[PDB]
Write a protein that holds these residues in place. Structure first.
Motif, PDB file in Angstrom:
ATOM      1  N   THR A 253      33.717 -75.567  64.154  1.00  0.00           N
ATOM      2  CA  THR A 253      32.617 -76.013  65.235  1.00  0.00           C
ATOM      3  C   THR A 253      31.367 -76.263  64.754  1.00  0.00           C
ATOM      4  O   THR A 253      30.818 -77.282  65.437  1.00  0.00           O
TER       5      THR A 253
ATOM      6  N   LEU B  25      30.589 -68.337  68.372  1.00  0.00           N
ATOM      7  CA  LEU B  25      29.509 -68.383  69.186  1.00  0.00           C
ATOM      8  C   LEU B  25      28.680 -67.250  68.369  1.00  0.00           C
ATOM      9  O   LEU B  25      27.217 -67.319  68.208  1.00  0.00           O
TER      10      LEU B  25
ATOM     11  N   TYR C 112      28.772 -59.046  69.497  1.00  0.00           N
ATOM     12  CA  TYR C 112      30.099 -59.873  69.404  1.00  0.00           C
ATOM     13  C   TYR C 112      31.483 -59.132  69.037  1.00  0.00           C
ATOM     14  O   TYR C 112      32.336 -59.104  69.286  1.00  0.00           O
TER      15      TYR C 112
ATOM     16  N   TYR D  48      35.538 -68.965  79.473  1.00  0.00           N
ATOM     17  CA  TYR D  48      34.410 -69.811  78.949  1.00  0.00           C
ATOM     18  C   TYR D  48      33.204 -69.728  79.898  1.00  0.00           C
ATOM     19  O   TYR D  48      32.092 -69.652  79.199  1.00  0.00           O
TER      20      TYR D  48
ATOM     21  N   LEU E 220      31.701 -66.466  78.649  1.00  0.00           N
ATOM     22  CA  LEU E 220      31.146 -66.503  77.405  1.00  0.00           C
ATOM     23  C   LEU E 220      29.755 -67.328  77.480  1.00  0.00           C
ATOM     24  O   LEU E 220      28.775 -66.726  76.685  1.00  0.00           O
ATOM     25  N   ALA E 221      29.934 -68.492  78.078  1.00  0.00           N
ATOM     26  CA  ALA E 221      28.464 -69.004  78.269  1.00  0.00           C
ATOM     27  C   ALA E 221      27.286 -68.211  78.793  1.00  0.00           C
ATOM     28  O   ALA E 221      26.297 -68.322  78.063  1.00  0.00           O
TER      29      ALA E 221
ATOM     30  N   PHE F 251      26.203 -65.784  76.254  1.00  0.00           N
ATOM     31  CA  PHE F 251      25.465 -66.437  74.924  1.00  0.00           C
ATOM     32  C   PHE F 251      23.937 -66.619  75.541  1.00  0.00           C
ATOM     33  O   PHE F 251      23.005 -66.606  74.766  1.00  0.00           O
TER      34      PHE F 251
END
Ligand SMILES: *[C@@H]1O[C@H](CO[C@@H]2O[C@@H](C)[C@@H](O)[C@@H](O)[C@@H]2O)[C@@H](O[C@@H]2O[C@H](CO)[C@@H](O[C@@H]3O[C@H](CO[C@H]4O[C@H](CO)[C@@H](O)[C@H](O)[C@@H]4O)[C@@H](O)[C@H](O[C@H]4O[C@H](CO)[C@@H](O)[C@H](O)[C@@H]4O)[C@@H]3O)[C@H](O)[C@H]2NC(C)=O)[C@H](O)[C@H]1NC(C)=O
Ligand SMILES: CCCCCCCC/C=C\CCCCCCCC(=O)OC[C@H](COP(=O)(O)OCC[N+](C)(C)C)OC(=O)CCCCCCC/C=C\CCCCCCCC
Ligand SMILES: CCCCCCCC/C=C\CCCCCCCC(=O)OC[C@H](COP(=O)(O)OCC[N+](C)(C)C)OC(=O)CCCCCCC/C=C\CCCCCCCC
Ligand SMILES: CCCCCCCC/C=C\CCCCCCCC(=O)OC[C@H](COP(=O)(O)OCC[N+](C)(C)C)OC(=O)CCCCCCC/C=C\CCCCCCCC
Ligand SMILES: CCCCCCCC/C=C\CCCCCCCC(=O)OC[C@H](COP(=O)(O)OCC[N+](C)(C)C)OC(=O)CCCCCCC/C=C\CCCCCCCC
Ligand SMILES: CCCCCCCC/C=C\CCCCCCCC(=O)OC[C@H](COP(=O)(O)OCC[N+](C)(C)C)OC(=O)CCCCCCC/C=C\CCCCCCCC
Ligand SMILES: CCCCCCCC/C=C\CCCCCCCC(=O)OC[C@H](COP(=O)(O)OCC[N+](C)(C)C)OC(=O)CCCCCCC/C=C\CCCCCCCC
Ligand SMILES: CCCCCCCC/C=C\CCCCCCCC(=O)OC[C@H](COP(=O)(O)OCC[N+](C)(C)C)OC(=O)CCCCCCC/C=C\CCCCCCCC
Ligand SMILES: CCCCCCCC/C=C\CCCCCCCC(=O)OC[C@H](COP(=O)(O)OCC[N+](C)(C)C)OC(=O)CCCCCCC/C=C\CCCCCCCC
Ligand SMILES: *[C@@H]1O[C@H](CO)[C@@H](O[C@@H]2O[C@H](CO)[C@@H](O)[C@H](O)[C@H]2NC(C)=O)[C@H](O)[C@H]1NC(C)=O
Ligand SMILES: CC(C)CCC[C@@H](C)[C@H]1CC[C@H]2[C@@H]3CC=C4C[C@@H](O)CC[C@]4(C)[C@H]3CC[C@]12C
Ligand SMILES: CC(C)CCC[C@@H](C)[C@H]1CC[C@H]2[C@@H]3CC=C4C[C@@H](O)CC[C@]4(C)[C@H]3CC[C@]12C
Ligand SMILES: C[C@]12CC/C(=N\OCCN)C[C@@H]1C(=O)C[C@@H]1[C@@H]2CC[C@]2(C)C(=O)CC[C@@H]12
Ligand SMILES: [Mg+2]
Ligand SMILES: [Mg+2]
Ligand SMILES: [Mg+2]
Lengths: 993, 40, 294
Positions: free
Chosen positions: A758, A833, A964, C33, C36-37, C40
């Motif tokens: 990524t 991430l 995380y 997702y 997830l976004a 973050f």
């Protein structure tokens, strides 16, 4: 080497005469050949010795280990890396050496893996060479009318050869004159008892006739003469060995799984490369750069530590096997046992012990059972009656065999005994629960003995009575129970004597049929006290006239005997059947004995029935009953010769308990092939040469170590050095355990792929400084990650593995889309991430806010711009901004380790919870501790920012990946929960590996 | 502060490296302890 | 295989699933997702709430300031022919880009510019690093100060007849006070004459002992006529607190330069809070490879 002419069943010239034989090969029946003629033939066709195997040089197999399927992928990766380096060198000035480093590293990985795998296969070959003990042998040939002993390599076709009990048949002979000669046809034809060889012909099948001696066979008792018909490789076992060597090898299941795995890895790799090649050509870049992008993306998607991890994984389970005496020659043959679903076994030497043993005894109108197990771990037979003592005296006296000198060390059952197999079995039983027979024999002196006669059908002898109060004479005799029954009138019941009324005569008939139906051979023993008044102590009973009363004897009891199976044979067969493995017997022995042994080891479960059994229970012909009502079937070899392909398919498709009897080695191979044609894995377990073509074509061969033949031992893939059969069960258990572990480790090494790619994708699409360098990816793939992935093998079972059905080969794979959806789709995404989070944090604390990073790579990379404005207005030189980028690589790598903690914990178990299984795996704990110590060492040791380009981190950064990781742990925990409560639901058919 | 604000541009990386190594060493030892704890 | 796994007509499946399945998977991934976004983004917002807008928390990777110049040399080399005009265009274009920011039209009015001492002076503190007082005020720096290299007279700046110029500049650092060496017996040879305490000296020389002779007369231009930077243009309060801020500049003319031969000239600044690095060749000093081939 015509295989079809070698696949055919043996033919011969047995049905001939002595004149026709001597007229075809040329030979004097009473004078043999001449020395000059003998040498003329010796030089004309070749010595009577089998050809040596096709030697395999060590550099050939070393080069073999350097290639394969996985190592080839790494090879193409190295090639691609050097290609991209060449392009960068000829197209741009100051080319970075990242690609050249990655390429030499991949090459080194392949070379190291090859060295380790090769060293292991060599270790096994050395311990394998320590077993071929070949002592020269010389035969007795008669030339020019004289007897001479010459090396086995000098015998030719046509000369006269004499054999004697204890010697080995040199070549294939045609018996011309015999004297009570018996041979052991167990290795070649598979006949447990000693078949007598006679000059006359008896059966159309050469393996069944008695006028032919065979290669590698031994003459148990007697002497014989014969004309050498077949010599050298042209012999029976010679054609069999040549056929074995001229068979292909195959391709194990583990290899096919690794192949389909590489297929998926390359599918997604070339997909991401050709696609980002079009996207870059649409965003402006030139061709020269896009080609390098394509190669870089296709190389980053290749697991390098997976090769070493998989190799070590497979290597670990093989040591556990070597600890219990199970040696594998190759390295992948360790997994085939777990995937087996149909085991084809051999009877003589594999399912049994090939040694005659006293099984049942009759006395005091009661059947008694004796222990017939190798280590003598069972039940005694009540040695407290006088009847048993008299029986011991009868058998121990009326017997001429004696243990071979110098056996004072071996056990009572494994020692050598010179004599027939019946007298030997009796001698061993008496020496077992009655002490030393040598004193029992010297305690009573044998006066006169009349040897076994073909007409008398009995063996008798008179000896003195050791009773110090009775000086009379004792007479004992043994023989067939019918003949002996016709010679008695009394019965020793509990010690006293009684008449022979029809009540006990019928009890004796039922006992005879009981021991007979058990597939055993029964003998009768009787004795009588000769009146010292009619035969004083001085009278000599010369063996000429009726000096002893043939009738009016005292029958004491019957004594049966048969070859018993090895100790863990029934338990192992039951364990295999429990695991859903179909056990099919394939042996060349008499069906009357094969069926009994089958009903004794578990192949034919008690209760099931054959078509003949039903016809006998009803008293109707066999052509009337329907074959669908019979679960078990006994297929005879003679009938197997005349059967189509579909018929065999139906035989295996409708009968669950199959037993192939009287099948030739070629037929054995045909049976194995008939099993493969459908789609199941096959494991053949054998010991002799007749099993060589069966062990070779089977998916996995298991040869016996002590009782096995050298040819079948060299053509097999797994060797049982201890001859233990429970080991098959152990193997099937380990084969599964290491499979579920390979799945867990693969998902682990594949989850880190995403946070390792990524960054470059966002680098080309978003134009941000490089987040993950090349020496860091190398420090993650080839370093830290190795110990945890290796530890994932030491994981114990979750549920009973010896309970679930065998895995389906056409549907349940090793690497499915359910795994890719987890590693590449859910866990790897979170890890990526987290890495980007730590990244942005490092750049935001030093002055480069996230809004000003998009669009800087052109000036962030330029080597001549010593004034790069940040979000606050400061001017940064080139080397100053590069130091920060490197520190961002160091923290990215540390973030990877932090998320790998939770990945190794969620990968530990596939379904069960952590609070259930438990963290009892000490290796995994050590892996986590070492994984952290290595990252700290690579960052804090002086001179690393010079050698590897990794700068020290400030204690507040190390905590940017912790949330995380905890999230990954909670997500997978709830994942592994709905699967348990909801069996068969969405989470199972979507995320259950 | 003011003109002599030199401390605003200094960081004791030395002490940080020393501590980070002490810690790495300790973690390594503990690891070994756990690994061999049972084979004695 | 090939055809079936693509489209079968009994189970009405495409690629493997029915019409309703691809939707379950797509919806799941969209929700996953999306979460997830959002997570973050939240973790990045708390980060925006952690930093200050008027000062970088860490200022250690930029403690010893650099020394850059106006021409853009690819390998720190200045090579051009005195005949062919299309040879020194890349230099003049840059030079011009740098001086084009000191135009008087840009510097006008009371705000936000202020007239400062025409002669080097001391530091000037416009308070702390706050927003209490509005946008601070920066001193004006005129073009003309640089005498023969200003592009106002000879646009080319020198490159036209074998006499190039090199505008040196000190890297802008927030809250950085330049400090010069004191008058004590230990000071380099060069620095003794003209010790204006208020000036940070810049002095160029030759890398090798041989090259000395081939390099002629280094003529420096600056504020007050000295070869340095006036301390009055510091400190720098940062873009947010001082937009429209100009950093001093020093011009260097390499008159009497030997023709057709590569000359290695190393320029160096002297001072207390100034330290060089054997790895970074732009920390405090700088190197130039001039070659006026004609
Ligand atoms: C900062 O100052 C720069 C210079 O300012 C000049 O001098 C100062 C002291 C004041 O007197 C000021 O009023 C002056 O303008 C300023 O740059 C200048 O901008 C003008 C406007 O574009 C340019 O004029 C044009 O010149 C070209 C040819 O230029 C030649 O020389 C330059 C070097 O000077 C080379 O770079 C070129 O390649 C050429 O070799 C003319 O062709 C052009 O024609 C246009 O005007 C005529 C009428 O005169 C029309 O008929 C045409 O159709 C065209 O429309 C202009 O005459 C001037 O060249 C340029 N100077 C320099 C050195 O580049 C700069 O923009 C200011 N920046 C800021 C941010 O304030
Ligand atoms: C800068 C930005 C960063 C970008 C980073 C990208 C990172 C890449 C991450 C993941 C790569 C994804 C590539 C595709 C992976 C598919 C996996 C696959 O191919 O595995 C192989 C399986 C075989 O499995 P098996 O052996 O069990 O089969 C047994 C069959 N028996 C038993 C019946 C015979 O084959 C199958 O699954 C069948 C094939 C299904 C293919 C589906 C293709 C979907 C791909 C994209 C969809 C995008 C749509 C987006 C729009 C949504 C609408 C809004
Ligand atoms: C904000 C930060 C986020 C971080 C996220 C990442 C976290 C990942 C790291 C650690 C997670 C720890 C999870 C804790 C799980 C504890 C589970 C547990 O306790 O379940 C109890 C089990 C079950 O027992 P039973 O009933 O089956 O026994 C039967 C016995 N009979 C047979 C005799 C009757 O008991 C057993 O397993 C036996 C005893 C085992 C004791 C294990 C103790 C060690 C635990 C962790 C090691 C630390 C690793 C640190 C890595 C960092 C390195 C720097
Ligand atoms: C059960 C068994 C347990 C076994 C555990 C074993 C653990 C071993 C633990 C420690 C040994 C590590 C190696 C020690 C290296 C000492 C290097 C050293 O003392 O350097 C000092 C000088 C630095 O001097 P300076 O500050 O004046 O430089 C100023 C430079 N300026 C100013 C130009 C920037 O060095 C220099 O100059 C040149 C630097 C040379 C670079 C050498 C580094 C080696 C690179 C990679 C090997 C690491 C592989 C990882 C192995 C892991 C094993 C577990
Ligand atoms: C069991 C657990 C194992 C744990 C170990 C971790 C595994 C590590 C795995 C992969 C890492 C290996 C990658 C090798 C990187 C070599 C980098 C290299 O060659 O860079 C070349 C640099 C040049 O740089 P420049 O152009 O900026 O110089 C400019 C100089 N100016 C400007 C002053 C003129 O030269 C220099 O740094 C000069 C100093 C040379 C340093 C060589 C260090 C070699 C390090 C490792 C090799 C041995 C590893 C074997 C262990 C395998 C474990 C399985
Ligand atoms: C920011 C928030 C921080 C919150 C911290 C909370 C810490 C909580 C501390 C301990 C948790 C409680 C202990 C749980 C013990 C449960 C014992 C038990 O009997 O369990 C059984 C059930 C499974 O039952 P079943 O019906 O599926 O079995 C089916 C069996 N068959 C398939 C054979 C039919 O187990 C289960 O439900 C297990 C499901 C539990 C999932 C919750 C995970 C909690 C997350 C982290 C814990 C902290 C560890 C890491 C420390 C980090 C330090 C910084
Ligand atoms: C920084 C990183 C942060 C990452 C955070 C990630 C949080 C996001 C977690 C979950 C969100 C996904 C929810 C998707 C819901 C829509 C899916 C759907 O449309 O599903 C339909 C099915 C019902 O169809 P059926 O089976 O009856 O039909 C039978 C059909 N046939 C035969 C094919 C099986 O749904 C079902 O089965 C029910 C299954 C529902 C899925 C449960 C998964 C829960 C996983 C994680 C939640 C835990 C978060 C913990 C975070 C702690 C933070 C501190
Ligand atoms: C079950 C598994 C067990 C696993 C145990 C593994 C063992 C862990 C081993 C060591 C960890 C302790 C590390 C202590 C190091 C302190 C050293 C120190 O002096 O460090 C100071 C820094 C402040 O640095 P600065 O930048 O401000 O100044 C820089 C100033 N210059 C650079 C100018 C000098 O501070 C720091 O590094 C902060 C150090 C990190 C603080 C520790 C946080 C612990 C987190 C969770 C544990 C909670 C346990 C709760 C108990 C539950 C019982 C049931
Ligand atoms: C069964 C039981 C087993 C138990 C085994 C225990 C093993 C012993 C355990 C720990 C030993 C701790 C040793 C501590 C060493 C401190 C060295 C140190 O603090 O040096 C720092 C300075 C370099 O600072 P700088 O100014 O250049 O910074 C850069 C500044 N900038 C870049 C801004 C200009 O050093 C220098 O100058 C001179 C450096 C000279 C070379 C020292 C070599 C140290 C390398 C490795 C030893 C560490 C191994 C620890 C075990 C880990 C196992 C994985
Ligand atoms: C500039 O350099 C030139 C040399 O290239 C110097 O002039 C030379 O002086 C010597 C006497 O020392 C004469 O022999 C040469 O003929 C002169 N050459 C030229 C071209 O004039 C000159 O003195 C130097 N000027 C400065 C200011 O450094
Ligand atoms: C099982 C779980 C909960 C244990 C988590 C342990 C974490 C908190 C430990 C593991 C390694 C530790 C780090 C090891 C080394 C250093 C370097 C030192 O100069 C500051 C502390 C610092 C940065 C430690 C902080 C705490 C740390 C990150
Ligand atoms: C547990 C999960 C699903 C929660 C995710 C919550 C998401 C939707 C929340 C968490 C933090 C939130 C952000 C916090 C701060 C800002 C800045 C503001 O000027 C605009 C809204 C914006 C950008 C918010 C948008 C919504 C947001 C991203
Ligand atoms: C793609 C990559 C090599 C492969 C790689 N990881 O390989 C691990 C295999 N699993 C990631 C590396 C990077 O991100 C950086 C890449 C490098 C190739 C060469 C590249 C593309 C360059 O010229 C600049 C960036 C360099
Ligand atoms: Mg056999
Ligand atoms: Mg094989
Ligand atoms: Mg990788």
């Amino acid at each position: 080497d015509l295989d079809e002419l070698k696949k055919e069943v043996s033919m011969d010239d047995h049905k001939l005469s002595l004149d026709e034989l001597h007229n075809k090969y040329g030979t004097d029946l009473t004078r043999g050949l001449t020395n000059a003629r003998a040498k003329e033939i010796l030089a004309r066709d070749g010595p009577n010795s089998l050809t040596p195997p096709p030697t395999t040089p060590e550099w050939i197999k070393f080069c073999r280990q350097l290639f394969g399927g996985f190592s080839i992928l790494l090879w193409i990766g190295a090639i691609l890396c050097f290609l991209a380096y060449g392009i960068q060198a000829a197209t741009e000035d100051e080319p970075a050496n990242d690609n050249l480093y990655l390429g030499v590293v991949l090459s080194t990985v392949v070379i190291v893996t090859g060295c380790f795998s090769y060293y292991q296969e060599a270790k096994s070959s050395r311990i394998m060479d320590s077993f071929k003990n070949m002592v020269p042998q010389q035969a007795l040939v008669i030339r020019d009318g004289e007897k001479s002993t010459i090396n086995a390599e000098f015998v030719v076709a046509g000369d006269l050869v004499e054999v004697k009990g204890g010697d080995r048949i040199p070549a294939d002979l045609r018996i011309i004159s015999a004297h009570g000669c018996k041979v052991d046809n167990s290795s070649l034809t598979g006949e447990s008892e000693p078949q007598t060889r006679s000059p006359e012909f008896s059966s159309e099948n050469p393996l069944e006739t008695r006028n032919i001696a065979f290669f590698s066979t031994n003459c148990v008792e007697g002497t014989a003469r014969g004309v050498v018909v077949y010599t050298g490789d042209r012999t029976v076992m010679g054609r069999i060995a040549t056929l074995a060597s001229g068979l292909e090898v195959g391709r194990t299941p583990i290899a096919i799984e690794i192949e389909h795995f590489i297929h998926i890895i390359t599918g997604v790799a070339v997909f991401l490369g050709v696609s980002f090649f079009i996207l870059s050509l649409i965003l402006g870049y030139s061709w020269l750069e896009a080609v390098i992008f394509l190669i870089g993306i296709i190389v980053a998607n290749v697991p390098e530590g997976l090769l070493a991890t998989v190799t070590v994984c497979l290597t670990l389970t093989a040591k556990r096997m070597a600890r219990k005496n199970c040696l594998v020659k190759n390295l992948e043959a360790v997994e085939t046992l777990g995937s087996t679903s149909t085991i084809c076994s051999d009877k003589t030497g594999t399912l049994t012990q090939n040694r005659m043993t006293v099984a049942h005894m009759w006395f005091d109108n009661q059947i008694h059972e004796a222990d017939t197990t190798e280590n003598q771990s069972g039940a005694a037979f009540d040695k407290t009656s006088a009847t048993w003592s008299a029986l011991s005296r009868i058998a121990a006296l009326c017997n001429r065999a004696v243990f071979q000198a110098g056996q004072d060390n071996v056990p009572i059952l494994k020692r050598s005994v010179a004599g027939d197999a019946s007298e030997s079995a009796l001698l061993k039983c008496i020496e077992l629960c009655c002490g030393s027979v040598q004193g029992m024999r010297d305690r009573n002196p044998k006066i006169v003995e009349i040897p076994f006669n073909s007409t008398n059908k009995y063996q008798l002898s008179i000896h003195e009575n050791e009773k110090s109060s009775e000086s009379r004479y004792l007479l004992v005799m043994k023989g067939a129970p019918e003949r002996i029954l016709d010679r008695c009138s009394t019965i020793l019941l509990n010690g006293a004597e009684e008449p022979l009324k029809e009540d006990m005569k019928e009890a004796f008939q039922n006992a005879y049929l009981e021991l007979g139906g058990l597939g055993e051979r029964v003998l009768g023993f009787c004795h009588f006290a000769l009146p010292e008044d009619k035969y004083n102590e001085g009278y000599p009973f010369d063996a000429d006239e009726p000096n002893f009363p043939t009738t009016d004897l005292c029958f004491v009891g019957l004594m049966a005997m048969i070859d018993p199976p090895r100790a863990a044979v029934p338990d192992a067969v039951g364990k295999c059947r429990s695991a859903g493995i179909k056990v099919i017997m394939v042996t060349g022995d008499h069906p009357i004995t094969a069926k009994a042994i089958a009903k004794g080891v578990g192949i034919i479960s008690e209760g099931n029935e054959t078509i003949e059994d039903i016809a006998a229970r009803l008293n109707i012909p066999i052509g009337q009953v329907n074959p669908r009502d019979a679960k078990a079937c006994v297929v005879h070899g003679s009938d197997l010769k005349d059967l189509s392909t579909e018929v065999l398919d139906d035989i295996l498709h409708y009968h669950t308990e199959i037993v192939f009897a009287r099948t030739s080695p070629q037929q054995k191979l045909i049976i194995v092939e008939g099993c493969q044609r459908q789609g199941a894995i096959v494991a053949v377990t054998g010991d002799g040469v007749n099993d060589s073509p069966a062990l070779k074509k089977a998916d996995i061969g298991v040869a016996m170590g002590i009782s096995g033949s050298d040819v079948s031992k060299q053509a097999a893939d797994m060797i049982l050095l201890d001859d233990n059969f429970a080991s098959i069960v152990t193997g099937v258990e380990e084969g599964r355990l290491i499979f579920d572990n390979l799945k867990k480790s693969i998902a682990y090494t594949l989850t880190s792929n995403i946070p390792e790619i990524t960054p470059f994708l966002v680098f080309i699409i978003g134009n941000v400084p490089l987040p993950l360098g090349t020496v860091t990816i190398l420090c993650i793939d080839l370093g830290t990650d190795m110990v945890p992935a290796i530890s994932l093998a030491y994981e114990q079972a979750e549920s009973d593995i010896m309970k679930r059905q065998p895995r389906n080969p056409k549907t349940d794979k090793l690497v499915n889309e359910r795994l890719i959806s987890m590693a590449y789709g859910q866990i790897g995404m979170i890890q990526a991430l987290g890495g980007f989070f730590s990244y942005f944090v490092i750049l935001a604390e030093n002055g480069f806010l996230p809004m000003d990073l998009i669009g800087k790579r052109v000036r962030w990379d330029d080597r001549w711009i010593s004034d790069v404005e940040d979000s606050f207005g400061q001017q940064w030189t080139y080397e100053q901004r590069k130091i920060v980028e490197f520190t961002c690589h160091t923290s990215f790598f540390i973030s990877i380790v932090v998320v790998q903690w939770a990945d190794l914990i969620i990968c530990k178990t596939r379904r069960n919870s952590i609070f259930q299984q438990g963290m009892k795996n000490k290796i995994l704990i050590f892996g986590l501790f070492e994984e952290t110590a290595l990252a700290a060492f690579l960052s804090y040791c002086p001179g690393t920012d010079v050698a590897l380009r990794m700068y020290p981190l400030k204690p507040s950064w190390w905590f940017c990946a912790f949330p995380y990781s905890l999230i990954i742990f909670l997500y997978d925990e709830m994942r592994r929960f709905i699967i348990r409560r909801s069996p068969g639901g969405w989470v199972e058919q979507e995320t259950y590996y | 502060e003011g003109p002599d604000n030199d401390e605003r541009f200094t960081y004791d990386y030395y002490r940080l490296r020393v501590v980070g190594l002490i810690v790495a060493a300790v973690l390594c030892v503990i690891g070994i302890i756990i690994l061999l704890a049972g084979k004695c | 295989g090939w055809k079936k796994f693509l489209w079968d007509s009994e189970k009405k499946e495409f690629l493997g699933r029915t019409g309703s399945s691809w939707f379950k998977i797509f919806l799941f991934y969209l929700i996953f997702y999306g979460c997830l976004a959002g997570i973050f983004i939240g973790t990045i917002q708390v980060l925006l709430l952690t930093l200050s807008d008027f000062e970088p928390k860490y200022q250690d990777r930029v403690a010893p300031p650099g020394l850059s110049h106006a021409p853009y040399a690819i390998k720190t080399e200045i090579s051009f022919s005195i005949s062919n005009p299309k040879s020194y265009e890349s230099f003049v274009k840059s030079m011009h880009k740098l001086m084009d920011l000191y135009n008087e039209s840009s510097q006008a009015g009371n705000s936000p510019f202020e007239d400062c001492s025409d002669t080097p002076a001391d530091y000037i503190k416009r308070g702390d690093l706050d927003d209490s007082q509005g946008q601070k005020k920066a001193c004006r720096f005129s073009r003309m100060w640089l005498k023969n290299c200003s592009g106002l007279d000879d646009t080319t700046y020198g490159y036209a007849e074998g006499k190039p110029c090199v505008v040196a500049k000190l890297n802008r650092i927030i809250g950085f006070y330049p400090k010069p060496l004191k008058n004590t017996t230990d000071l380099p040879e060069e620095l003794q004459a003209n010790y204006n305490q208020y000036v940070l000296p810049l002095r160029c020389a030759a890398k090798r002992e041989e090259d000395r002779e081939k390099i002629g007369s280094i003529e420096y231009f600056g504020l007050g006529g000295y070869a340095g930077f006036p301390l009055q243009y510091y400190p720098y309060y940062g873009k947010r607190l001082q937009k429209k801020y100009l950093q001093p500049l020093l011009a260097i003319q390499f008159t009497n330069l030997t023709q057709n031969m590569e000359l290695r000239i190393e320029c160096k600044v002297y001072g207390e809070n100034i330290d060089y690095s054997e790895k970074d060749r732009f920390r405090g000093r700088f190197e130039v490879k001039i070659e006026v081939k004609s």
